[PDB]
Amino acid sequence: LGSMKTERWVVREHVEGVPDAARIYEKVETELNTRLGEEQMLLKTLYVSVDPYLQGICLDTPIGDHMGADSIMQVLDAGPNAPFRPGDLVQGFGGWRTHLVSDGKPKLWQTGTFPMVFPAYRKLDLRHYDDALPLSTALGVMGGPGMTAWGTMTKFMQVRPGDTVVVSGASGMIGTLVGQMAKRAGARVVGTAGSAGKARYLSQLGFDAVIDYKLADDADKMREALREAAPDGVDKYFDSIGGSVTDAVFSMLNVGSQVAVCWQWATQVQRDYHGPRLLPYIMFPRATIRGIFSLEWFTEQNWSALHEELGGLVRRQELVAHETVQDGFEHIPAAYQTLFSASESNRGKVLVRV
Amino acid sequence: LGSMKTERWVVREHVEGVPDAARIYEKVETELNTRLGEEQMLLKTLYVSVDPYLQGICLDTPIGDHMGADSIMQVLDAGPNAPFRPGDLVQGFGGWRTHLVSDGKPKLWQTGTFPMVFPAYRKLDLRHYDDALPLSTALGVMGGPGMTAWGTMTKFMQVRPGDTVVVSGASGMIGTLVGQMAKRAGARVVGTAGSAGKARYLSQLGFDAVIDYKLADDADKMREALREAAPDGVDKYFDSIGGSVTDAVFSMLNVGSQVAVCWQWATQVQRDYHGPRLLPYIMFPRATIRGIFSLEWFTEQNWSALHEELGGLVRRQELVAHETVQDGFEHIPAAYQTLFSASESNRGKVLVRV
Ligand SMILES: NC(=O)c1ccc[n+]([C@@H]2O[C@H](COP(=O)([O-])OP(=O)(O)OC[C@H]3O[C@@H](n4cnc5c(N)ncnc54)[C@H](OP(=O)(O)O)[C@@H]3O)[C@@H](O)[C@H]2O)c1
Ligand SMILES: NC(=O)c1ccc[n+]([C@@H]2O[C@H](COP(=O)([O-])OP(=O)(O)OC[C@H]3O[C@@H](n4cnc5c(N)ncnc54)[C@H](OP(=O)(O)O)[C@@H]3O)[C@@H](O)[C@H]2O)c1
Ligand SMILES: CC[C@@H]1C[C@@H]2C[C@H]3/C=C\C=C\C(=O)NCCC[C@@H]4NC(=O)/C(=C(O)/C=C/C=C/[C@H](O)[C@H]3[C@@H]2[C@H]1C)C4=O
Ligand SMILES: CC[C@@H]1C[C@@H]2C[C@H]3/C=C\C=C\C(=O)NCCC[C@@H]4NC(=O)/C(=C(O)/C=C/C=C/[C@H](O)[C@H]3[C@@H]2[C@H]1C)C4=O
């Protein structure tokens, strides 16, 4: 049969800490075989996600392999028993590649720290998307990030009116969704941000107080900032940061509090591996801490409820989901790099349209 | 009108770390005014509990005050509007005193780390007791520690046939109670213990493996023993120790695992305040970690349930609830000292008959 020319970003070099996109990634030209097994598909990439958790995926990617990532793909061609037909849109972990072949079946992440299984590709139905909630939201508020926020806030956390909710890593999409939902449930909402503009932006989304984690560098400076922003204690904590801000929150946990652990940026990215033992602080509060791994909620029923509940709020404008769509496959690493800059222009989910 | 000489153990000196019980405490004769107020009672102590959690209570007890502890008392005299009548048997936080005047209402622990409120005295009634459930069980299987184990197993942990339940600090009444209920639900149960002789005691109670925590110094050695003792990973963990055993367990948590935090001996007594950050290990397992503070279960309906459910199994000797009752009020601090220094001989709940 035949082949096609494709471009891929591949992992050139492993560097821990804050990644250097120009140094770690290299754009190569690749020839793709277009011969399809009975259930395989030939896919074109329309949109690609960039996310912080790619820092850890990258370090587990064999050198030379392509950078994995969440993406939106269109089926160009398909074998006879492929799950989707040409023209069908799917969301899945297609990676930083213009084109690819895959059967869309669940695949195990072999070289990762845990036995993680990337989900089967998911069919996208155009009826769910419009100008208010466009197709690219399948990578954001109607995707992984939305599912993480919405699943946590309806399957685990039980915000009550009058509660104080703290959200670390609040300026990103998952943080802002959690805060806005908490607000709807009647809570005082405290966030952390890196800039006066980002802090003002969270105040526009309805955060009642925002702490600057660059001035508050230590649990001490942090404890004081929290005690001011949350004088009555903390009832819920949505944690994407860990490290010293989380150490400070655990000193002021109220009774029956709940902590959702979504990420530990300060450990994973900043390599903060040791610190004060936190478990001694949860007994009298009777606090509940749940690890979040939102892949467990990727079910057809959860996707429908996501669209009904969360999609309605976004559409009625009762809940704001911003995205920064950068254009051009060649600018994927540059767009990924801004997740770690000091630029305040990073509103919501960062995306690349290809 | 009248008075009455009594003896009390008072806190002479504050000593951090492992208690030196003969240096910390001092036995004093105290004349008690027995002119009761309207809601007040005069009570006589029949038994006292000694517990590792008394180490922190003591540290928070101002010099010269009496040492608090759980006790079984008997109402000698009672004012008109007293909540109990002479001859009534009650359980409450009477402390290391031979006699005392209290109104038995709930009381705020004004000097503690946290805002703890000691419960109101609860009446005992002799009919529920016999030689299989002696009256002294209101300080163990039918008291605080029984409420701690049964409440964790029926209100938090959901042990299912085939689980591997790990229990740190398993020789005492709470740890052994957890293991036996877990075995009754179908689990493999792993404990820790300090003596070869208690290891064989736990096994004969149903434990499928017992680590020597004294032999396994650090996290590493403890992972090796746990890898051996629980090869399918940990599904439930009942923690009373924290420190390096708990660090080990968190490296091998299964998906959906439940951790219950009962105490942190390593931090409270051994002063180990820093360690590896544990929250990074719980996201992929979706672990749930709940702090235990069984005072929230001290409810009339919950006591009834504890009798019904545990009373039967205990009397039949299905579920084994041992006690070690020392004799003599002057021996209370030495009995308490054994929990830290000479526990090799103890079996279940250490109490002291006065
Ligand atoms: N467990 C799961 O299932 C799961 C699922 C999806 C995602 N995640 C993770 O959860 C996180 C949430 O997603 P997101 O879209 O909301 O990411 P994100 O927060 O946008 O990631 C980068 C942001 O974090 C902030 N940040 C960086 N260092 C910080 C620090 N030391 N303290 C506080 N904030 C800091 C920055 O905000 P400023 O610009 O204001 O500094 C920046 O905008 C992501 O990191 C992702 O990897 C977990
Ligand atoms: N959270 C709550 O609401 C609550 C309520 C009640 C009690 N608690 C606490 O829960 C624990 C259990 O109660 P219990 O009555 O069964 O007391 P216990 O376990 O008998 O307490 C002392 C025993 O723990 C063992 N131990 C000492 N150091 C250890 C270590 N590093 N690792 C493992 N075991 C060690 C010793 O047993 P060996 O003889 O085997 O060395 C000792 O006899 C205690 O810490 C108690 O204060 C908490
Ligand atoms: C096709 C759909 C897409 C598939 C994608 C799979 C996950 C991506 C990355 C997972 C990484 C991971 O599991 N360990 C890396 C080890 C370090 C660290 N330790 C963690 O426990 C952890 C995390 O829990 C991350 C969680 C991230 C959740 C995402 O939503 C989904 C992506 C999802 C939208 C960490 O990053
Ligand atoms: C009349 C009935 C009786 C009343 C008694 C009160 C508690 C005793 C001690 C509580 C201490 C306390 O809370 N802070 C000290 C702080 C350090 C440490 N940090 C904790 O979180 C913690 C603990 O949670 C203890 C939990 C203990 C549970 C007991 O069964 C009940 C006793 C109970 C049987 C600690 O010891």
Automatic annotation (TrEMBL), chains A, B:
<keyword id="KW-0547">Nucleotide-binding</keyword>
<dbReference type="InterPro" id="IPR013149">
    <property type="entry name" value="ADH-like_C"/>
</dbReference>
<dbReference type="InterPro" id="IPR020843">
    <property type="entry name" value="ER"/>
</dbReference>
<dbReference type="InterPro" id="IPR041694">
    <property type="entry name" value="ADH_N_2"/>
</dbReference>
<dbReference type="InterPro" id="IPR011032">
    <property type="entry name" value="GroES-like_sf"/>
</dbReference>
<keyword id="KW-0560">Oxidoreductase</keyword>
<feature type="binding site">
    <location>
        <position position="262"/>
    </location>
    <ligand>
        <name>NADP(+)</name>
    </ligand>
</feature>
<feature type="binding site">
    <location>
        <position position="173"/>
    </location>
    <ligand>
        <name>NADP(+)</name>
    </ligand>
</feature>
<dbReference type="InterPro" id="IPR036291">
    <property type="entry name" value="NAD(P)-bd_dom_sf"/>
</dbReference>
<feature type="binding site">
    <location>
        <position position="53"/>
    </location>
    <ligand>
        <name>NADP(+)</name>
    </ligand>
</feature>
<protein>
    <submittedName>
        <fullName>Ox4</fullName>
    </submittedName>
</protein>
<dbReference type="Pfam" id="PF00107">
    <property type="entry name" value="ADH_zinc_N"/>
</dbReference>
<dbReference type="GO" id="GO:0016628">
    <property type="term" value="F:oxidoreductase activity, acting on the CH-CH group of donors, NAD or NADP as acceptor"/>
</dbReference>
<feature type="binding site">
    <location>
        <position position="343"/>
    </location>
    <ligand>
        <name>NADP(+)</name>
    </ligand>
</feature>
<feature type="binding site">
    <location>
        <position position="213"/>
    </location>
    <ligand>
        <name>NADP(+)</name>
    </ligand>
</feature>
<feature type="binding site">
    <location>
        <position position="174"/>
    </location>
    <ligand>
        <name>NADP(+)</name>
    </ligand>
</feature>
<feature type="binding site">
    <location>
        <position position="175"/>
    </location>
    <ligand>
        <name>NADP(+)</name>
    </ligand>
</feature>
<feature type="binding site">
    <location>
        <position position="294"/>
    </location>
    <ligand>
        <name>NADP(+)</name>
    </ligand>
</feature>
<feature type="binding site">
    <location>
        <position position="292"/>
    </location>
    <ligand>
        <name>NADP(+)</name>
    </ligand>
</feature>
<feature type="binding site">
    <location>
        <position position="171"/>
    </location>
    <ligand>
        <name>NADP(+)</name>
    </ligand>
</feature>
<feature type="binding site">
    <location>
        <position position="270"/>
    </location>
    <ligand>
        <name>NADP(+)</name>
    </ligand>
</feature>
<dbReference type="Pfam" id="PF16884">
    <property type="entry name" value="ADH_N_2"/>
</dbReference>
<feature type="binding site">
    <location>
        <position position="172"/>
    </location>
    <ligand>
        <name>NADP(+)</name>
    </ligand>
</feature>
<dbReference type="InterPro" id="IPR045010">
    <property type="entry name" value="MDR_fam"/>
</dbReference>
<feature type="binding site">
    <location>
        <position position="198"/>
    </location>
    <ligand>
        <name>NADP(+)</name>
    </ligand>
</feature>
<feature type="domain" description="Enoyl reductase (ER)">
    <location>
        <begin position="17"/>
        <end position="352"/>
    </location>
</feature>
<feature type="binding site">
    <location>
        <position position="194"/>
    </location>
    <ligand>
        <name>NADP(+)</name>
    </ligand>
</feature>
